[PDB]
Design a binder for this molecule. Sequence first.
Ligand SMILES: O=C(O)c1cncc(-c2ccccc2)c1
Length: 168
Amino acid sequence: VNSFSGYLKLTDNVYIKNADIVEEAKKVKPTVVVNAANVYLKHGGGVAGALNKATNNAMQVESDDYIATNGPLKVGGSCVLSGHNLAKHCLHVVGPNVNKGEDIQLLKSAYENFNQHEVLLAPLLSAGIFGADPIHSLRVCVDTVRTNVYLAVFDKNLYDKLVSSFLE
Ligand SMILES: O=C(O)c1cncc(-c2ccccc2)c1
């Protein structure tokens, strides 16, 4: 049903809310929730851990089965798997891990995957343990994605910084 509420317009196609993406997926019933994935689709923490836990490990069993056919994803790559109880689809997207010297230029490639989906509920890619500046990631989102993105940002202090950088 894609019932997004309380999202702040940043651009004509990029929206942002200070919210837990799991709680968002349960209220919004989005067609697509984006996972901040690693190449092995091992959902051990952050957004991936959160989404998987909310599926009571359904996502992790499907993910393994995919990895068995594919081997690992490419950095900048994605797959479309079931959203389980959270969404029709989960778009698992691998942003570069700049901690491991993966090139920040691959963040554009990661966001380009969003353009395959009319409307997405999504985190910022390559933030947190992936080590990219989240405000940089938002700029790459805005520059790259032309389909309708609804970004959920868990942390209020980071949310305010993001909105201050974008609108002030
Ligand atoms: O089956 C569909 O066409 C569909 C499309 N978008 C969202 C959903 C959905 C997503 C989460 C919960 C319940 C329903 C289903």
